[PDB]
Amino acid sequence: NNPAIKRIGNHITKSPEDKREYRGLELANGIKVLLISDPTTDKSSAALDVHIGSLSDPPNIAGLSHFCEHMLFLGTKKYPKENEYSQFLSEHAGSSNAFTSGEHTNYYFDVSHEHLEGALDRFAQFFLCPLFDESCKDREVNAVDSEHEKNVMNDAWRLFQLEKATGNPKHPFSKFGTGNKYTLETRPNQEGIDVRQELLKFHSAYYSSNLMAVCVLGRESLDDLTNLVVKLFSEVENKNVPLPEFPEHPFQEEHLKQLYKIVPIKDIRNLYVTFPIPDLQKYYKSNPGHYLGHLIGHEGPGSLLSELKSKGWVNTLVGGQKEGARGFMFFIINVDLTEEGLLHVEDIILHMFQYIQKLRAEGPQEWVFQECKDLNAVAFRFKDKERPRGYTSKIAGILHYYPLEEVLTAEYLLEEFRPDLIEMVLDKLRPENVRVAIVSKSFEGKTDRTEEWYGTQYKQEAIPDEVIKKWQNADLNGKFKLPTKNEFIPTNFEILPLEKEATPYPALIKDTAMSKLWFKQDDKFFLPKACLNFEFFSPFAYVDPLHCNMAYLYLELLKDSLNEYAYAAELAGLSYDLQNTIYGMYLSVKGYNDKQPILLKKIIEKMATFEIDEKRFEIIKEAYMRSLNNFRAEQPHQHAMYYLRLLMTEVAWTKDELKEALDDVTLPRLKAFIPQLLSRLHIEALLHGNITKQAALGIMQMVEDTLIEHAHTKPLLPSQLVRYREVQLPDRGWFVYQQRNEVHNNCGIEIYYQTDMQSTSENMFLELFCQIISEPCFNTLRTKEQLGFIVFSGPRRANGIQGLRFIIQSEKPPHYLESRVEAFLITMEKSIEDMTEEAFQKHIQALAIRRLDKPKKLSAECAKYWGEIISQQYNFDRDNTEVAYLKTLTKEDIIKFYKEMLAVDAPRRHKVSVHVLAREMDSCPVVGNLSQAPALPQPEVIQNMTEFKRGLPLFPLVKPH
Numbered sequence: 001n002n003p004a005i006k007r008i009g010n011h012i013t014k015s016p017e018d019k020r021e022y023r024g025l026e027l028a029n030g031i032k033v034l035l036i037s038d039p040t041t042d043k044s045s046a047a048l049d050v051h052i053g054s055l056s057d058p059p060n061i062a063g064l065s066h067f068c069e070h071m072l073f074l075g076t077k078k079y080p081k082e083n084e085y086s087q088f089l090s091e092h093a094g095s096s097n098a099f100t101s102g103e104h105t106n107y108y109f110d111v112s113h114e115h116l117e118g119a120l121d122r123f124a125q126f127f128l129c130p131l132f133d134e135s136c137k138d139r140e141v142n143a144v145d146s147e148h149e150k151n152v153m154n155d156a157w158r159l160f161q162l163e164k165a166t167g168n169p170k171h172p173f174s175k176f177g178t179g180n181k182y183t184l185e186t187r188p189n190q191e192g193i194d195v196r197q198e199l200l201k202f203h204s205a206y207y208s209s210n211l212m213a214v215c216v217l218g219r220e221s222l223d224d225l226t227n228l229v230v231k232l233f234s235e236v237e238n239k240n241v242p243l244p245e246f247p248e249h250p251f252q253e254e255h256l257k258q259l260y261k262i263v264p265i266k267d268i269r270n271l272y273v274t275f276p277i278p279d280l281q282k283y284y285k286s287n288p289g290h291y292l293g294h295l296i297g298h299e300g301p302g303s304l305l306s307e308l309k310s311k312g313w314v315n316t317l318v319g320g321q322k323e324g325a326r327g328f329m330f331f332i333i334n335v336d337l338t339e340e341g342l343l344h345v346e347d348i349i350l351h352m353f354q355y356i357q358k359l360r361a362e363g364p365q366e367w368v369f370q371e372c373k374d375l376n377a378v379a380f381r382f383k384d385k386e387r388p389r390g391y392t393s394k395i396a397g398i399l400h401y402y403p404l405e406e407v408l409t410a411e412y413l414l415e416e417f418r419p420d421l422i423e424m425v426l427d428k429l430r431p432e433n434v435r436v437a438i439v440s441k442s443f444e445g446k447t448d449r450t451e452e453w454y455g456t457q458y459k460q461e462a463i464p465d466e467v468i469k470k471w472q473n474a475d476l477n478g479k480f481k482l483p484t485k486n487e488f489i490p491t492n493f494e495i496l497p498l499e500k501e502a503t504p505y506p507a508l509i510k511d512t513a514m515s516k517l518w519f520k521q522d523d524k525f526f527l528p529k530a531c532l533n534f535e536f537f538s539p540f541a542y543v544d545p546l547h548c549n550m551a552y553l554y555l556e557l558l559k560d561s562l563n564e565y566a567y568a569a570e571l572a573g574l575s576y577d578l579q580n581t582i583y584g585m586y587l588s589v590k591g592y593n594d595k596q597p598i599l600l601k602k603i604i605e606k607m608a609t610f611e612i613d614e615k616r617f618e619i620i621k622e623a624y625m626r627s628l629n630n631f632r633a634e635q636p637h638q639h640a641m642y643y644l645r646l647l648m649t650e651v652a653w654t655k656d657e658l659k660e661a662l663d664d665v666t667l668p669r670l671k672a673f674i675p676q677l678l679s680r681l682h683i684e685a686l687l688h689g690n691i692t693k694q695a696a697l698g699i700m701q702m703v704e705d706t707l708i709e710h711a712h713t714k715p716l717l718p719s720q721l722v723r724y725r726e727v728q729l730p731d732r733g734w735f736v737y738q739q740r741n742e743v744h745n746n747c748g749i750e751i752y753y754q755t756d757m758q759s760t761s762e763n764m765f766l767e768l769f770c771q772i773i774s775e776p777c778f779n780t781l782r783t784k785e786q787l788g789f790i791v792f793s794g795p796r797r798a799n800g801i802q803g804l805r806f807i808i809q810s811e812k813p814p815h816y817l818e819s820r821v822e823a824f825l826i827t828m829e830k831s832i833e834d835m836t837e838e839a840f841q842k843h844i845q846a847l848a849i850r851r852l853d854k855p856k857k858l859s860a861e862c863a864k865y866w867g868e869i870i871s872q873q874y875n876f877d878r879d880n881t882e883v884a885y886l887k888t889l890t891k892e893d894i895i896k897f898y899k900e901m902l903a904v905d906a907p908r909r910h911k912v913s914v915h916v917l918a919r920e921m922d923s924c925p926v927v928g929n930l931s932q933a934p935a936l937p938q939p940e941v942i943q944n945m946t947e948f949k950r951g952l953p954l955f956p957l958v959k960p961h
């Protein structure tokens with residue numbers, strides 16, 4: 001009845017909570033398709049996943065599939081303009097990205113719901129007739145080179161590639177997926193290769209309809225979505241490509257029983273333990289690898305981690321199955337390492353094998369399976385509604401692995417108890433199949449090997465056969481017990497009836513010296529979940545570097561202490577977040593509401609009566625020291641942002657000040673700090689979800705009463721509720737602050753054009769301008785000018801003040817970067833003068849959709865309110881208000897705003913620039929086809945942050961709504 005469709009699927013199993021409608025189908029050309037209809041969605045979305053990636057890169061052109069991914073965005077026969085795609089999305093409230101894994105290339109976008117077809121049509125052409133334009137290729141190669149550059153000095157990426165380097169060199173696993181200028185341009189030139197043709201060959205070879213899945217989400221009916229997907233995708237050609245497979249493991253015989261000693265960039269201490277395993281993917285109905293992951297990676301009483309931590313050897317552990325590709329997987333057990341732990345690796349691994357032996361001795365446990373199965377069933381039933389773009393991306397990828405009818409449920413619902421598989425996998429976790437990697441600065445100078453792509457310094461040794469034996473004879477350790485029943489498993493899921501006096505926004509339901517309580521019963525999502533957000537104010541968390549250190553250590557020690565007990569809550573979908581802030585403390589509790597009161601109470605009770613284990617204090621202090629030091633290894637652009645925070649905020653302690661003050665933190669001194677901190681507080685809370693007003697008032701009073709009882713807490717004076725201000729820059733001023741990054745060989749720059757206080761009008765001026773310049777900026781400064789991978793523009797908001805910021809990471813020096821941004825600003829003004837009245841209105845419309853986009857899930861809506869509360873603006877109806885005003889703005893208003901605040905000769909330009917110089921750059925000046933960059937004034941070089949701040953006014957704070 002339709003030659004274009006091979007088959008429609010049966011019912012797609014969904015959560016009964018889920019109001020969205022679904023249809024699976026397979027096209028005649030073999031594209032597997034999931035259609036999602038949500039007539040309420042603000043943004044629509046599509047994604048396509050090709051089952052080809054890096055593992056299929058030609059051996060002579062490393063990174064070609066990743067390069068292909070970049071290239072697809074840059075013009076097709078039907079839509080030749082390099083930025084037609086991104087520009088269209090931008091003008092219609094959409095966004096887009098893509099990634100390349102070993103076996104996948106995944107492309108996705110969202111757009112205003114009214115413009116699905118326009119978006120999707122442009123999108124489809126990626127997979128039909130890409131141009132791979134000659135000039136785009138030459139340019140885009142730098143973006144990829146830049147992508148790789150930032151990864152070079154990153155410890156995760158180095159370990160990632162090092163593993164691949166130390167397996168079978170013949171195996172596709174050993175390939176370099178990212179690529180760079182060398183692999184994508186330099187080497188290929190030297191070798192007579194036309195990469196444009198190679199891109200064409202590759203696309204044509206592997207971009208076969210038979211290796212593709214597509215997911216589309218929109219307001220349209222399932223039938224309309226069907227016609228649409230047929231109309232645009234049934235013309236993709238079926239080239240019948242065999243799906244690549246890797247049945248032989250990249251780790252063979254001679255790759256096992258190997259030790260690797262590795263030098264990190266950061267001062268980190270890690271042990272990596274790895275076993276080769278078969279592909280467990282097909283066993284998705286039982287997840288035997290996850291069963292063992294769940295047990296070996298447990299953190300409750302009796303667990304592997306518990307003992308390792310008690311012995312003061314490790315702080316954290318990750319265990320479980322790790323993805324490989326079709327035909328191979330890994331099982332891992334990874335831990336960080338204390339100083340002591342570094343000298344006891346052999347015992348740690350013994351304990352690991354002892355725990356595994358316990359699992360053998362006990363045999364597989366149906367009740368453990370049953371518990372996971374139940375938790376997963378609940379998780380799936382009450383899953384939060386996803387944002388469309390993440391969802392379509394995810395589904396496109398998993399359409400390759402499960403029957404149509406099962407795509408939604410397959411990763412959640414367990415069906416089979418499989419003691420056989422559990423033992424089969426367990427039988428592979430043996431010392432004769434082990435790989436051990438130690439990462440420590442102590443191997444500095446003691447290595448004899450260098451990994452090609454990153455330069456990673458390492459050494460390789462056979463593990464002594466006697467050590468293997470010691471591990472093989474590991475017997476039972478009395479310290480290791482399986483976890484017992486999980487008491488935190490929720491059973492009460494009733495959604496409370498919507499109260500008579502319920503409101504659309506949070507209501508101030510308690511206003512006392514001790515606490516401000518904001519409250520909202522959920523009127524949208526109707527899942528049995530809640531958010532309990534608390535802000536504790538104390539001047540003593542940030543009075544000086546010492547106290548800041550102490551606030552941090554206190555809360556880290558608290559969390560470390562609670563970890564065992566809290567682990568079960570987390571498995572049961574009840575988690576918490578607890579950290580020190582520049583104003584005191586922040587506590588959030590979220591998840592199923594049923595057992596929250598229990599977790600919260602244990603938290604507050606513990607913090608009010610805390611007793612510190614000295615062993616733990618020393619270990620945590622030491623890790624915190626390294627943590628601070630390790631900032632020197634963050635990326636230039638991150639340093640840039642850091643220095644701006646420091647320059648523009650009234651009060652801010654530097655990482656240098658914090659670490660210098662850290663040696664003065666003694667056990668006696670901390671014990672004294674805690675009661676001090678807790679003795680006077682103000683609390684501002686937002687309780688939001690499946691809870692009544694009486695429950696909310698009840699919870700708030702419980703928190704207070706616990707503090708009063710155990711810590712004697714009294715209220716804080718209203719005048720002690722100190723918010724910090726932002727530095728007020730002089731009209732027509734320009735400051736430059738300059739530092740060097742000693743790890744990375746790239747530059748970073750942040751340029752901040754401060755405007756004025758936040759307000760309806762000032763907000764929308766800035767925001768409209770950012771909307772208009774957003775993609776032109778990416779297009780000019782990255783795509784055309786290829787300055788770097790990281791090119792960013794948009795609003796800066798802090799302390800109630802705002803402005804325009806640019807952030808770039810580049811191999812080019814900041815003074816050069818600077819003039820290009822300035823050049824760009826002028827382009828934008830002409831551009832704004834040149835654009836139609838409609839083109840203007842389209843941008844108003846796009847920002848309007850962006851701002852009005854409704855949160856899909858409780859925590860997202862909660863987050864919007866929390867922003868209103870923590871900023872002390874309390875403007876819960878901001879979106880409607882600000883959009884109404886947005887629609888009033890004319891082209892002329894924006895031109896004036898720019899001329900008055902932003903232009904190079906603007907009367908009220910307030911400019912700060914942070915230059916972060918590359919490792920290899922000695923000094924560097926602060927000032928200096930392509931568009932015209934204007935002449936700039938001499939900047940005032942900031943010599944000292946304190947003096948700079950002392951010499952300027954401070955802005956007012958914003959007035960509450």
Ligand SMILES: [Zn+2]
Nearest residue numbers: 066070144147
């Ligand atoms: Zn990329």
